[PDB]
Structures are given as C-alpha cells and as structure tokens.
C-alpha cells in the first residue's frame, strides 16, 4: 500500500537554495527547472524510463538583516516576485529589466509574513512522457550532444525584490520544494549502484558489485 508510485514519488523534496539582496552585485535568483540536481529524488525517479507527472512548487523566502553601519533605519514590509518563465519564453538579463512585466510569464507577488507562496505547473512536454534516459543525440548533426532530448524542458524560475524595504542591506534566501503529482511510470529499470557525478549525464566511475565478506561459508 505504501509501495504505490503515488506514495513513493510524492514527497516534498528541497531541490534549490540561494540568496538575493536589495543592494550590491547579487540582486536576483534563477534556476532552470530540472529534477536531476538532488540525488535523493533523482535516484527514485531513475527507477523508471518514462514518467509523466505534474509539479507543485512551494517557496520558503526568509530575509535576514545583513551586518552594516547605515544609521537611522526603519524598514518597511518586503514584497517579493517569483516569475516562472514557461518553455520558449523571454528571460531577464538584469533585475530592473522590461521582461519582468511580460504578461505570459505567471509571476506571483507575495508580501513578507504570510503563508508561503505556491503554484502548480501542468505536464509541459509536447510529447507523451518525459524521458529519464535518452539514447540519442539532441540534433541530427554532429553538433548535437548525446543523451539530452529537448522535450524535457520544464522552463526556468526567476525571483527578486519588488522594492528595497529599508535603507540598509538585507539578504533574502529562497528554498524551492518539488512535489510530483498524478505520477505514471513505465518500463522499470535497475537502481544506480554507482555514485552520481554530474547532473547532465549518466557518466560514472566503475565500482564493485557489492560489499565484501570474510569467506563464502561465512
């Protein structure tokens, strides 16, 4: 009963943690949607070849007062904007760009001190199932990289500070949770055995089959 894929692949897993400020060089966050960065969830997803699911994104945004020497401070409430760029959509080159205003990118404004913001993304493949494993080239020409189908593109995620609250410096961290929903899986395949190296490929270092013992009669 706990072994159904709905009960095996529907756990809120943290897949990204970063920090952006109201002043300074770092002013926004970005993260191409891809589920292969967290190994604990990648290893569970890699039990099947093709998986079709929906995503529930939960963001935990917390702001800390950066140490500074600016006198006479009195902060206001901070408002954040999380803009989710759908596949084939314009992406911001800077914080105060004109791409944050585009209407086809469903951004969500959230005011500090409430329930965490949350939005649900539907199946975004132009095909019939996401492919955990691909045995081909991205392009017909030699230029195409091996094992990278352009059909598992889930989009990108940009976050920023709508306004600078106080006159002092403030750093805000954003944690992203991944929760797959309505999961269907096809063609089960063996577990990893080896350790993971990169997020883009299945490259690995050859390892033993299992752990050793004193003797065969032990």
């Amino acid at each position: 009963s706990e072994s159904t894929i709905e009960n095996f692949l529907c756990r809120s897993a943290c897949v990204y943690f970063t920090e952006y400020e109201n002043s300074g060089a770092k002013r926004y966050a970005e993260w191409v949607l891809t589920p292969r960065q967290a190994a604990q969830l990648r290893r569970k997803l890699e039990f099947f070849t093709y998986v079709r699911f929906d995503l529930e994104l939960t963001f935990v945004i917390t702001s800390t007062q950066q140490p500074s020497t600016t006198q006479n401070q009195d902060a206001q409430i901070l408002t954040h904007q999380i803009m989710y760029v759908p596949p084939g959509g314009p992406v911001p080159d800077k914080v105060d760009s004109y791409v944050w205003q585009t209407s086809t990118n469903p951004s969500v404004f959230w005011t500090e001190g409430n329930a965490p913001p949350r939005m649900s993304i539907p199946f975004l493949s132009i095909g019939n199932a996401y492919s955990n494993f691909y045995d081909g080239w991205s392009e017909f020409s030699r230029n195409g990289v091996y094992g990278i189908n352009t059909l598992n593109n889930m989009g990108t995620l940009y976050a920023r500070h709508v306004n600078a609250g106080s006159t002092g410096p403030i750093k805000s961290t954003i944690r992203i949770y991944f929760k797959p929903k309505h999961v269907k899986a096809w063609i089960p395949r063996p577990p990893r055995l080896c350790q993971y190296e990169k997020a883009k490929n299945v490259n690995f270092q050859p390892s033993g089959v299992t752990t050793t013992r004193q003797s065969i009669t032990t």
């Binding site: 493949s125 019939n128 045995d135 030699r142 063609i187 063996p190 055995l193 080896c194 490259n203």
Partner: protein, 245 residues
C-alpha cells in the same frame, strides 16, 4: 525435431519448443492525425536479417548490438531509414548458439530500452564511433577503461556501461541460455518510446546485450569457441506518407 519459419524470402530453423518471451506482454501491433499527419506502412521490410556470427571464447566479456543501427545498411530497412524520416518498428531477436554436450557455460540475452551508455571521462560524452558499430558487434571489457582526455564509452562488463549492477539487468525482457539445457532465445520487443514516430538515425529504440555470466569451459580437443548467431526481424514497421493531401 526442428521447425522452419518462412518470413518473406528468408527461412530459419528453430526447435519445436521455443519458449518465446513477449517483451511486456504486448505484441508489436500497428498504430491505432488524418490528413494533417499521413502515415504509410511497409511490409516487404519484414524478413529475417542474419547478422555476422561472433566467436564466444573463454576470455570473452560480452557484446552489444543497437537494434535500429545494426540493420542501418542491410536491405530495405537500411534504405527506408535513408528515404522516409519518421518511423516506428518492433523486433523479434533470435539469438541461437550451437555447442556440443561437452561444452559448459551460461549467457544472458537481454533487450534494454534507452541504454544510455557512460563515458570514461566524466566531463564529456562518448563519440558515436565508439558508441555505434555498424555491421559489427561492440564488445565489453574486463578491466575499467582508463580515463583521460578521450571520448571512450565506459565498457566494463559488471557496470554494463549504464552504471548499474549487472545482476539486476533481469528487470528487462530477457532469457538465459544454459549450454546443458536451453540452446536458443527468442524475444519479441514492442515499440517502446514517448512519441508515436521518431527519427531512426538520431535515436536507438532498443539495445541487445549478450553477456556470459559463467565462462565457457571445455577439455583440450573440443572446438575452442562457440559461434553465437543473431537473427533480427523488423515487425509492424510504418513510415510517414510522402504524398500531398
């Protein structure tokens, strides 16, 4: 007693009992968007394509043949892949192995879907030359491939080049060959892919792996190898219509 199975021009000899292993309980049937996406089926393509035999010796790790790539150069299948663009096909492997009663060994014949291989160097991906072998099987390796600034596919036999435990490859449609009982293996593979039709030169649908778990052993005087022989038949293959609605 034996049997004969005539598909088109080709004829092949098989045992009365063949214990066929249908892939996922599904027979490779046809496809069940009108004028917008016309499709045309090809029949003569179906027939028995016999690949070159491979000699199985005591020091032999294993082999691997990509099912779409292997026939990319033989008859109509090799031709159709060059003419038409999109195509969906199913297969029927016929791995047969002949050795006397004084030979001993064991082989695993497994059809792996989307067998994405690894690379010696973690930074880059394997070259298509070291990945695709046409009109010839590709062999595994006993010791790990030395890593460096190269695009050599990882080919260790135990990791299988996909970075898993070779004892767990059974999850996929498979069949064992004990040189004291079974002498052949038949595996019918349906069309497994996310899309109804795919480009056949840019994507391998299925991969055929034959790995000997138990080493071949014989007494001095017997033939010092065992000629494994593979026969592939494309099944229910259809291609895009080149007409004008």
């Amino acid at each position: 007693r034996a049997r004969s199975i005539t598909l088109g021009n080709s004829t092949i000899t098989t045992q009365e009992c063949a214990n066929v292993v249908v892939g996922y309980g599904v027979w490779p049937d046809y496809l069940k968007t009108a004028e917008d996406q016309p499709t045309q089926p090809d029949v003569a393509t179906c027939r028995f394509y016999t690949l070159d035999s491979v000699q199985w010796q005591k020091t032999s790790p294993g082999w691997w043949w990509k099912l779409p790539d292997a026939l990319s150069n033989l008859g109509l299948f090799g031709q159709n892949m060059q003419y038409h663009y999109l195509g969906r096909t199913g297969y029927t492997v016929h791995v047969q192995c002949n050795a006397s009663k004084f030979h001993q060994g064991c082989l695993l014949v497994v059809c792996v879907p989307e067998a994405e291989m690894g690379c010696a160097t973690l930074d880059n991906t394997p070259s298509s030359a070291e990945l695709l072998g046409g009109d010839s099987a590709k062999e595994f390796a006993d010791k790990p491939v030395a890593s460096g600034s190269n695009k050599l596919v990882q080919r260790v036999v135990y990791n299988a080049g996909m970075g898993v435990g070779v004892g767990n490859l059974t999850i996929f449609p498979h069949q064992w060959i004990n040189l004291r009982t079974n002498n052949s293996a038949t595996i019918v593979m349906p069309y497994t892919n996310s899309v109804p039709m795919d480009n056949m030169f840019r994507h391998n649908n299925v991969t055929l792996m034959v790995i000997p778990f138990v080493p071949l052993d014989y007494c001095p005087g017997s033939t010092t190898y065992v000629p494994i022989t593979v026969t592939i038949a494309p099944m229910c293959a259809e291609y895009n219509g080149l007409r004008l609605a």
